[PDB]
Design an enzyme around this catalytic site. Structure first.
Site, PDB file in Angstrom:
ATOM      1  N   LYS A   1      -2.476   0.101 -13.150  1.00  0.00           N
ATOM      2  CA  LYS A   1      -1.120   0.237 -13.561  1.00  0.00           C
ATOM      3  C   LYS A   1      -0.888  -1.464 -14.008  1.00  0.00           C
ATOM      4  CE  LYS A   1       3.617   1.035 -11.866  1.00  0.00           C
ATOM      5  NZ  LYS A   1       4.451   1.658 -10.957  1.00  0.00           N
ATOM      6  N   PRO A   2      -0.481  -1.484 -15.146  1.00  0.00           N
ATOM      7  CA  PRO A   2      -0.469  -3.106 -15.885  1.00  0.00           C
ATOM      8  C   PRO A   2       0.587  -3.762 -14.890  1.00  0.00           C
ATOM      9  CG  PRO A   2      -0.142  -1.287 -17.368  1.00  0.00           C
ATOM     10  CD  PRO A   2       0.212  -0.548 -16.246  1.00  0.00           C
ATOM     11  N   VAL A   3       1.654  -3.350 -14.608  1.00  0.00           N
ATOM     12  CA  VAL A   3       2.780  -4.065 -13.851  1.00  0.00           C
ATOM     13  C   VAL A   3       3.470  -3.249 -12.734  1.00  0.00           C
ATOM     14  CG1 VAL A   3       4.943  -5.481 -14.275  1.00  0.00           C
ATOM     15  CG2 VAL A   3       3.375  -5.408 -16.286  1.00  0.00           C
ATOM     16  N   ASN A   4       3.782  -3.793 -11.638  1.00  0.00           N
ATOM     17  CA  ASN A   4       4.261  -3.352 -10.653  1.00  0.00           C
ATOM     18  C   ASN A   4       4.914  -4.235  -9.629  1.00  0.00           C
ATOM     19  OD1 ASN A   4       4.832  -0.821  -9.030  1.00  0.00           O
ATOM     20  ND2 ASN A   4       4.015  -1.784  -7.598  1.00  0.00           N
ATOM     21  N   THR A   5       6.329  -4.058  -9.166  1.00  0.00           N
ATOM     22  CA  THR A   5       7.042  -4.890  -8.386  1.00  0.00           C
ATOM     23  C   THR A   5       7.294  -4.135  -6.910  1.00  0.00           C
ATOM     24  OG1 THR A   5       8.085  -5.722 -10.225  1.00  0.00           O
ATOM     25  CG2 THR A   5       9.060  -6.213  -8.026  1.00  0.00           C
TER      26      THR A   5
ATOM     27  N   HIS B   1      12.760   4.572 -10.100  1.00  0.00           N
ATOM     28  CA  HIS B   1      11.999   3.922 -11.105  1.00  0.00           C
ATOM     29  C   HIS B   1      12.403   2.336 -11.016  1.00  0.00           C
ATOM     30  CE1 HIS B   1      10.403   3.769 -15.339  1.00  0.00           C
ATOM     31  NE2 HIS B   1      11.077   2.626 -15.514  1.00  0.00           N
ATOM     32  N   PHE B   2      11.428   1.551 -11.017  1.00  0.00           N
ATOM     33  CA  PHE B   2      11.881  -0.010 -11.005  1.00  0.00           C
ATOM     34  C   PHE B   2      11.807  -0.238 -12.337  1.00  0.00           C
ATOM     35  CE2 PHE B   2      12.227  -4.037  -8.371  1.00  0.00           C
ATOM     36  CZ  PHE B   2      12.066  -4.875  -9.473  1.00  0.00           C
ATOM     37  N   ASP B   3      13.097  -0.632 -13.023  1.00  0.00           N
ATOM     38  CA  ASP B   3      13.187  -1.144 -14.461  1.00  0.00           C
ATOM     39  C   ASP B   3      12.810  -2.360 -14.877  1.00  0.00           C
ATOM     40  OD1 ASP B   3      13.725   0.647 -16.892  1.00  0.00           O
ATOM     41  OD2 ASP B   3      15.118  -0.991 -16.931  1.00  0.00           O
TER      42      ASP B   3
ATOM     43  N   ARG C   1       1.073  -8.484 -11.624  1.00  0.00           N
ATOM     44  CA  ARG C   1       0.748  -8.268 -12.942  1.00  0.00           C
ATOM     45  C   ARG C   1      -0.934  -8.331 -13.302  1.00  0.00           C
ATOM     46  NH1 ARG C   1      -0.076  -6.424 -17.576  1.00  0.00           N
ATOM     47  NH2 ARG C   1       0.395  -7.818 -19.391  1.00  0.00           N
TER      48      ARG C   1
ATOM     49  N   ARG D   1     -17.596  -0.292   1.745  1.00  0.00           N
ATOM     50  CA  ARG D   1     -16.248   0.018   1.639  1.00  0.00           C
ATOM     51  C   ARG D   1     -15.313  -0.387   2.918  1.00  0.00           C
ATOM     52  NH1 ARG D   1     -13.523   4.375   3.757  1.00  0.00           N
ATOM     53  NH2 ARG D   1     -15.170   5.758   3.455  1.00  0.00           N
TER      54      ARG D   1
ATOM     55  N   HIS E   1     -16.539  -2.008   5.483  1.00  0.00           N
ATOM     56  CA  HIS E   1     -16.737  -3.108   6.433  1.00  0.00           C
ATOM     57  C   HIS E   1     -17.359  -4.669   5.440  1.00  0.00           C
ATOM     58  CE1 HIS E   1     -16.989  -0.874   9.664  1.00  0.00           C
ATOM     59  NE2 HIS E   1     -17.936   0.035   9.409  1.00  0.00           N
TER      60      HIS E   1
ATOM     61  N   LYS F   1      15.727  -0.157 -19.568  1.00  0.00           N
ATOM     62  CA  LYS F   1      15.094  -0.723 -20.592  1.00  0.00           C
ATOM     63  C   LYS F   1      14.659   0.589 -21.550  1.00  0.00           C
ATOM     64  CE  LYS F   1      13.266  -5.217 -19.852  1.00  0.00           C
ATOM     65  NZ  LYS F   1      12.087  -6.265 -19.892  1.00  0.00           N
TER      66      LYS F   1
HETATM   67  O1  LIG Z   1       9.392  -5.554 -13.326  1.00  0.00           O
HETATM   68  C1  LIG Z   1       9.035  -4.726 -13.477  1.00  0.00           C
HETATM   69  C2  LIG Z   1       8.615  -4.115 -14.555  1.00  0.00           C
HETATM   70  C3  LIG Z   1       8.147  -2.996 -14.703  1.00  0.00           C
HETATM   71  N1  LIG Z   1       7.676  -2.091 -13.458  1.00  0.00           N
HETATM   72  C4  LIG Z   1       7.116  -0.844 -13.451  1.00  0.00           C
HETATM   73  O2  LIG Z   1       6.585  -0.610 -14.985  1.00  0.00           O
HETATM   74  C5  LIG Z   1       7.021   0.555 -15.367  1.00  0.00           C
HETATM   75  C6  LIG Z   1       7.053   0.286 -16.949  1.00  0.00           C
HETATM   76  O3  LIG Z   1       7.959  -0.863 -17.251  1.00  0.00           O
HETATM   77  C7  LIG Z   1       8.367   0.313 -14.695  1.00  0.00           C
HETATM   78  O4  LIG Z   1       9.097   1.609 -14.914  1.00  0.00           O
HETATM   79  C8  LIG Z   1       8.006   0.518 -13.271  1.00  0.00           C
HETATM   80  O5  LIG Z   1       7.133   1.348 -12.855  1.00  0.00           O
HETATM   81  P1  LIG Z   1       7.801   2.748 -12.282  1.00  0.00           P
HETATM   82  O6  LIG Z   1       8.818   2.404 -11.046  1.00  0.00           O
HETATM   83  O7  LIG Z   1       8.430   3.771 -13.402  1.00  0.00           O
HETATM   84  O8  LIG Z   1       6.372   3.258 -11.292  1.00  0.00           O
HETATM   85  C9  LIG Z   1       7.782  -2.813 -12.207  1.00  0.00           C
HETATM   86  O9  LIG Z   1       7.322  -2.429 -11.205  1.00  0.00           O
HETATM   87  N2  LIG Z   1       8.403  -4.006 -12.498  1.00  0.00           N
HETATM   88  O1  LIG Z   2     -15.930  -1.831  12.613  1.00  0.00           O
HETATM   89  C1  LIG Z   2     -16.214  -1.881  13.758  1.00  0.00           C
HETATM   90  C2  LIG Z   2     -16.249  -0.484  14.507  1.00  0.00           C
HETATM   91  C3  LIG Z   2     -16.488  -0.473  15.779  1.00  0.00           C
HETATM   92  N1  LIG Z   2     -16.864  -1.684  16.537  1.00  0.00           N
HETATM   93  C4  LIG Z   2     -17.108  -1.658  18.188  1.00  0.00           C
HETATM   94  O2  LIG Z   2     -17.550  -0.347  18.452  1.00  0.00           O
HETATM   95  C5  LIG Z   2     -16.524   0.162  19.414  1.00  0.00           C
HETATM   96  C6  LIG Z   2     -16.384   1.766  19.178  1.00  0.00           C
HETATM   97  O3  LIG Z   2     -15.856   1.915  17.925  1.00  0.00           O
HETATM   98  C7  LIG Z   2     -15.137  -0.713  19.156  1.00  0.00           C
HETATM   99  O4  LIG Z   2     -14.223  -0.642  20.029  1.00  0.00           O
HETATM  100  C8  LIG Z   2     -15.851  -1.872  18.754  1.00  0.00           C
HETATM  101  O5  LIG Z   2     -16.054  -2.689  20.165  1.00  0.00           O
HETATM  102  P1  LIG Z   2     -15.445  -3.759  20.862  1.00  0.00           P
HETATM  103  O6  LIG Z   2     -15.197  -5.157  19.935  1.00  0.00           O
HETATM  104  O7  LIG Z   2     -14.133  -2.984  20.897  1.00  0.00           O
HETATM  105  O8  LIG Z   2     -16.029  -4.212  22.161  1.00  0.00           O
HETATM  106  C9  LIG Z   2     -17.087  -3.000  16.043  1.00  0.00           C
HETATM  107  O9  LIG Z   2     -16.946  -3.862  16.458  1.00  0.00           O
HETATM  108  N2  LIG Z   2     -16.412  -2.867  14.402  1.00  0.00           N
END
Ligand SMILES: O=c1ccn([C@@H]2O[C@H](CO)[C@@H](O)[C@H]2OP(=O)(O)O)c(=O)[nH]1
Ligand SMILES: O=c1ccn([C@@H]2O[C@H](CO)[C@@H](O)[C@H]2OP(=O)(O)O)c(=O)[nH]1
Lengths: 124, 124
Positions: free
Chosen positions: A41-45, A119-121, A85, A10, A12, A66
């Protein structure tokens, strides 16, 4: 508890993508903004204009929602937005999106006092 | 309960000039991969090689971990990685990262059975 192995993957691992892509935006943003939990979420802007500009739409042109509610408003000008999308090949929990960069008028439902977007319509 | 106004902002607002730019990769990834909850993780590396190649490191060159643990391993070859580091402007809950694509050897801690990467230690 998440396994240490899974936690490493996750935190790295990104074997399937790279930064240089532009097409991966929706995949990452839908994940970031928590719209891929439980189902995809199927569609979002996403809107790239200022929050002030988007809020201002609630004081602009009244248009039909809508869903037939009467609280929708259309922007006076086009806005830079990204449509995300879900693709045909997308299958939860691996939510896949086509990223489309668009410049269209947006339609938002507004609510609250002051009236703000809730809401984004659609885009038109 | 998340307010409707906040839900709209979460789902729909990404204000800025170049949302999909490669420079934004770390901002998106650190968010999506759950490393900006509670605080911004200061430094995090993503690896773009095969999971098999990353797992293989656990059978390569033993090296001491930065923290003195003795289960670290350095990759024999360089790998394509992306460094994500907080900028000097970054402040939770508005985490901000500089994205840097490099090729370096990785050092990981290996644990469990099978022995697999459990911690990303360093790059060299
Ligand atoms: O062009 C578009 C069309 C739709 N939407 C989002 O999908 C929900 C249902 O259409 C829209 O209501 C909206 O999501 P909501 O804001 O409700 O979370 C977009 O984001 N862009
Ligand atoms: O994902 C990571 C996490 C840590 N580091 C190195 O370890 C130091 C301490 O977090 C970080 O500072 C860093 O050493 P630096 O490159 O700064 O010498 C990574 O390189 N990647």
């Amino acid at each position: 508890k998440e396994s240490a192995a899974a936690k490493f993957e996750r935190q790295h691992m990104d074997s399937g993508n790279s930064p240089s892509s532009s097409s991966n935006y929706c995949n990452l943003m839908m994940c970031c903004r928590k719209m891929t939990q439980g189902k995809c979420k199927p569609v979002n802007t996403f809107v790239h204009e200022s929050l002030a500009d988007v809020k201002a739409v609630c004081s602009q042109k009244k248009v039909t929602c809508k869903n037939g509610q009467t609280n929708c408003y259309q922007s006076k000008s086009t806005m830079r937005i990204t449509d995300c999308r879900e693709t045909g090949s997308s299958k939860y929990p691996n939510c896949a999106y086509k990223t489309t960069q668009v410049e269209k008028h947006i339609i938002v439902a507004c609510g609250g006092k002051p009236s703000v977007p809730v809401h984004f319509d659609a885009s038109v």
